[PDB]
Enzyme design. Sequence first.
Site, short mmCIF file in Angstrom:
data_model
loop_
_atom_site.label_atom_id
_atom_site.label_comp_id
_atom_site.label_asym_id
_atom_site.label_seq_id
_atom_site.Cartn_x
_atom_site.Cartn_y
_atom_site.Cartn_z
N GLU A 63 -49.50 5.90 19.58
CA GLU A 63 -50.79 4.99 18.91
C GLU A 63 -51.59 5.13 17.67
OE1 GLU A 63 -48.82 2.23 17.36
OE2 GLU A 63 -49.66 0.87 17.85
N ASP A 104 -47.38 4.04 23.60
CA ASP A 104 -48.48 4.43 22.96
C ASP A 104 -49.32 5.78 23.52
OD1 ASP A 104 -48.17 1.54 22.26
OD2 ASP A 104 -49.71 0.27 23.30
N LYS A 121 -42.52 -7.49 27.50
CA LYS A 121 -42.36 -6.47 27.22
C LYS A 121 -40.90 -5.42 28.71
MN LIG Z 1 -48.65 -1.16 23.29
#
Ligand SMILES: [Mn+2]
Lengths: 179, 179, 179, 179, 179, 179, 179, 179
Positions: C64, C92, C118
């Site tokens: 990220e 990430d 998620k």
């Molecule tokens: Mn994330």
Amino acid sequence: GSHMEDFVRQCFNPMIVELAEKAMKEYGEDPKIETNKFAAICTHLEVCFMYSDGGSKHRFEIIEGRDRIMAWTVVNSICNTTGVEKPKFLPDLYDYKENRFIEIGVTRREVHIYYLEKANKIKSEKTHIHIFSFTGEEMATKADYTLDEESRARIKTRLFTIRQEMASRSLWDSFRQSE
Amino acid sequence: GSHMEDFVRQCFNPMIVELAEKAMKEYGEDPKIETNKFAAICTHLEVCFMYSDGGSKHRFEIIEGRDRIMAWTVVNSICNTTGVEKPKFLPDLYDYKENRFIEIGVTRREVHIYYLEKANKIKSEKTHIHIFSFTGEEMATKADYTLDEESRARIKTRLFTIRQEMASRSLWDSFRQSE
Amino acid sequence: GSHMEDFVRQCFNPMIVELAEKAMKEYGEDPKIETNKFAAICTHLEVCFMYSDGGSKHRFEIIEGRDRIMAWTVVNSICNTTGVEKPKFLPDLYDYKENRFIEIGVTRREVHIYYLEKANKIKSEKTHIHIFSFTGEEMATKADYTLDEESRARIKTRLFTIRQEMASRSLWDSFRQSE
Amino acid sequence: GSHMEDFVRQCFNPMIVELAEKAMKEYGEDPKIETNKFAAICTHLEVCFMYSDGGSKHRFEIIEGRDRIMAWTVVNSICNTTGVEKPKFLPDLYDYKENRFIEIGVTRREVHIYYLEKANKIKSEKTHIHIFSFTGEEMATKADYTLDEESRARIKTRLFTIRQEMASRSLWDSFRQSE
Amino acid sequence: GSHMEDFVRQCFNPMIVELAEKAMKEYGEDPKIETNKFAAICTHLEVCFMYSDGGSKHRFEIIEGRDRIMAWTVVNSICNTTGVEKPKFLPDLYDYKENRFIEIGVTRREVHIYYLEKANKIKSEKTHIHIFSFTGEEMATKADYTLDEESRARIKTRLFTIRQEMASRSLWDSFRQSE
Amino acid sequence: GSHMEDFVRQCFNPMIVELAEKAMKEYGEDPKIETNKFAAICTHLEVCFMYSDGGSKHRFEIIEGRDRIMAWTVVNSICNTTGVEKPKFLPDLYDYKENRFIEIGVTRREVHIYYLEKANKIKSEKTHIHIFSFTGEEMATKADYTLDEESRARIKTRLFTIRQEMASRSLWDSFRQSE
Amino acid sequence: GSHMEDFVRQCFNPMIVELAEKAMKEYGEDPKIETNKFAAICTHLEVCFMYSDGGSKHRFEIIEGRDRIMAWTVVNSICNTTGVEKPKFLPDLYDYKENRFIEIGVTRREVHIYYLEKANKIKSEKTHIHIFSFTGEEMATKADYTLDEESRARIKTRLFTIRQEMASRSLWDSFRQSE
Amino acid sequence: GSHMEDFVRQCFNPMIVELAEKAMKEYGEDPKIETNKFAAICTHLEVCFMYSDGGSKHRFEIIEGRDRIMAWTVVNSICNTTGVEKPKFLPDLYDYKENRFIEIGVTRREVHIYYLEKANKIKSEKTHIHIFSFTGEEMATKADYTLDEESRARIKTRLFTIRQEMASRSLWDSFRQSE
Ligand SMILES: [Mn+2]
Ligand SMILES: [Mn+2]
Ligand SMILES: [Mn+2]
Ligand SMILES: [Mn+2]
Ligand SMILES: [Mn+2]
Ligand SMILES: [Mn+2]
Ligand SMILES: [Mn+2]
Ligand SMILES: [Mn+2]
Ligand SMILES: [Mn+2]
Ligand SMILES: [Mn+2]
């Protein structure tokens, strides 16, 4: 204007060269004249710095390279803090891990002659002694070398690459006869 | 224009001196006047900083040296995070390793009188207490000194070299009578 | 000109705020308008940075906060390097210690609802999942929280001191209803 | 004006690119012309730097990326220091932990062909050999890979993200045929 | 992955390249795709910067290279300050010496065609117009070129050394046909 | 937690904001509370800085933004140096070109009402007076505006772009009623 | 290992020494061997830099000290910009004030012999010529010395303090016979 | 440990204090003891620096604050360059505008007694003389004060604010009796 005055300026770190100039002038010598001892006290300074660098991040306390008065001030503070006998001549480091002062030497004789020069002057050798050499040997009190095997090799490698660059300029032999 | 106002400015780090000025002025005092407490809160700040420096890189959380409001904000955040009782007076650090707040003291009496001054004010002494002294002693809760033996020696060595430089200027005795 | 646009600028680090502006504009949003998601992606960025900071010096690989194309490029490189299944949505981090990708979440619901949002989107949840919250809870895959107990407390303390400063400006409630 | 001259300048670190230009010009080549070997010696430099970076802070001694004469000087110093046989071709690193020199390779063939190219030239292979590849494999002497499993994965991930960005510009195939 | 994307990155200053990316993305274009206009708006930015640099230290006010909203904000502030008619399209500079806005152009046609493209769009050309070219010519309103003869030569020299380095990579001809 | 506390922090330079906090706290006010005067003394500081910046490199001597005691000290030094009457209230600058002190004002009324507020308080107006406004006007003693026409336009442009950004957040009207 | 290699390293600026090494190696010479020309091209570089420094901030364009190819590129750009005849050998500067190239010389003969060495090689001496000397004289085309009387004195003072420090090390005489 | 040793350290710039320590120790004095002359040579250094700062950017050449040997070296270089008589005692500056050396004095007597102390020692006063005082007067050769009226006022203002801060600590009177 000496060749080795230039070599000392170009070889060592500017802070170390400045501290060497300061210490030599404080004890009454001209780096432009007593050039061999200029290179000597530069080397001594650098070796002490790498020594305090080896080991833990805050394991050592640097005594050499300070003002006379301030260096002593630190020594008294450490002495009162832990409870160690106040040295007689100004030491170079203090090991907080081993609760003991350390005198660092760099010579051009054998480890034996330098260690002999230092031990009797220490008299009450309550503080540790550690010698280094441009050959690569090291004599230390009770064969306790304090530092890791890898940090000490770094120091001697550096000591020897200095000796090389000196020979490349035909200045090594004059250094060997000065001590 | 006091001698010790200058000595405090020349002795400590500019950031520490600035934070001391800010805290003293926030609680209604003039560093140019209440100079002894100026040196005191400079010393307290520096000792706390070296404390949080000893140990792991991100083991401590600094509470002293922040704004009143912001310091409290941090305390509430830590409290909710882990689950520790909200202190009564503002603590100095929080140990994430030991999940506990820490109050740091630096006194000119014995460890006993300072520890007594702090413990009853702590009342519910749910948070740890750690004292230091210009002599070199340290009293701590349950004799848990939190830090390594080498980090704590560093702090006391520093405390004592400050006491020395103060005596070199005949300012130590005035410091001793202020507490 | 929103209150929280200013609070986001003054609260987070300028690099993080710049990366948040870049990512939001790359996916078609105005930080001066969708301000709640501005604060959200700032927080997400900072939490990811502290996460990669906890643990070993070179243990994590940040995914990220990069360009879309470049982030993917890194993912393919890691995949070919170790031999892990190429994720479906952009993860990430990548743990080199545990040889596994990591998805970091920061929500205002319970750990359960966010983890549910998620996991099904992960489908083949071959990559780890780690949730954080402004309350202080954290749900993670197989209850393996990857990081030390002290690094994770730091993150949640930070998450909560943000929630505080938001309430000090009466902006917290608008943040809670946006998710 | 080549495409890959630009890609090499924009891809690697300016110090690495400068050292590559210096080494290539010292051994008689034009980075604006022998561009493939430009990218090669940039990559070799970077891989060596990350290698010496993995492991302890002062565990390795960098030999590649120095002046010819100075690099040799270091080698002689290490040799005299520890007591290792002086290599025949200039090595890339020295492990102080394992008391042995290290030759680092980065090839576009299999680990086998590159290792064969290096071992016979080493003749008296008293010094360690370590190969890397843009595919991700690595052959090393006695299957001792010297470094941690996490530092080596980092290197190969980097090697592969370079190969990707090269293919994005249709320059990868020319690189593959040059070796 | 275009050749000129790399050439633009390696040729211009990182701040200018970043501002060009920001402006192009704000007005809906991909520097990795509309690469010719990438080089164009980089050049335009740099020319404007050198222009504001020529002359007195605080003689000009930069309008290009800011955020849309902020650039306008500045324009309104200048307008109210001095008393000049608010422009219609966003200008590039404001001369405080001549109390007038300035539009800077950089074209690949003659000064005449570019000046014609700009003047009718200016409509009420209350603000000055200044054109530059990769050939070296410049048309300006009322033949008032605002700047010194030496600052303007610098700009055109720079414009032409860019055109050269583009031809060295066979990218100049594609640039010429894009406008 | 006020909106304008944030706007002041994000709008002005950190040094100016710090000096404003220091001056306001020294004269007994909370920037988190008397926020309008926070923005006011930030603006006043910045205007004074740009003023001393306009003109020659060492033409002005800054009096505002110093410690009370130190500011006075400077004033006495200048007074003895040249031979000017010691002011009654602390001035903001001293022109070495015109051998005269300067009081700088920034108001939200007309130049007339502010100039009237300042002149009678000056009593023996031996020192110059210079007013500025968020509208753009300026009244100065004997219509001598001290600075160049271009430096003064810069100041007013800045004053007005501040007024704009305040209106963008609906904070301008509260500022107008505070004076 | 020469004495003057060290003196050159310790005497000049590291950037100048690096550029001298680069230019000498590009035209096939070893600064560790052709040391006299090492000091020469260091001096030439420094004199050119101080020359371009004298006068206006952006009056000169440096041609010496660039890459061969890039230096030429600049020359072509200037030529097309203003309209001056393309020189035959690479010049050192371009005066934008006087619209003319400048060749800078530093010799150990008289101004006459050096000027003669340069003028016939210039052939079509369309570009200006300016000589300097360690004695202190200077011959220039049409007795137009381009620069102020104070900037030129600075250069010659510097040239002579170099000659002094060389004599302090008994290296001056070898320098005098090399030209 | 003197009060004024601290005041000198906290009052002047660290570089100036370091140069003062160096010069005093080179001519055989202890800044911790001959403290009044410590403050004196700090002041002298600072006044000389501001003097060379006033006027053109490269108008003066600093002679004070260098090494003995190097300072002389510069003097010989200037002498040979322009053609001025070699001074007898080491001067402080050289004006390239007026082609003349300058001796700067700072005294606690009248301009007359200090000027008398300097002129006869100058003997052949071929070099200019310029005196300054903590009162604010200045005597100079032929009433040519070399510098602008604004640069000289700055110097005297500084001289007087030093005298003030000294009186604030009751150290001024001891300074007055030392000269
Ligand atoms: Mn994330
Ligand atoms: Mn020793
Ligand atoms: Mn405490
Ligand atoms: Mn290798
Ligand atoms: Mn334009
Ligand atoms: Mn004021
Ligand atoms: Mn005012
Ligand atoms: Mn040349
Ligand atoms: Mn030349
Ligand atoms: Mn003098």
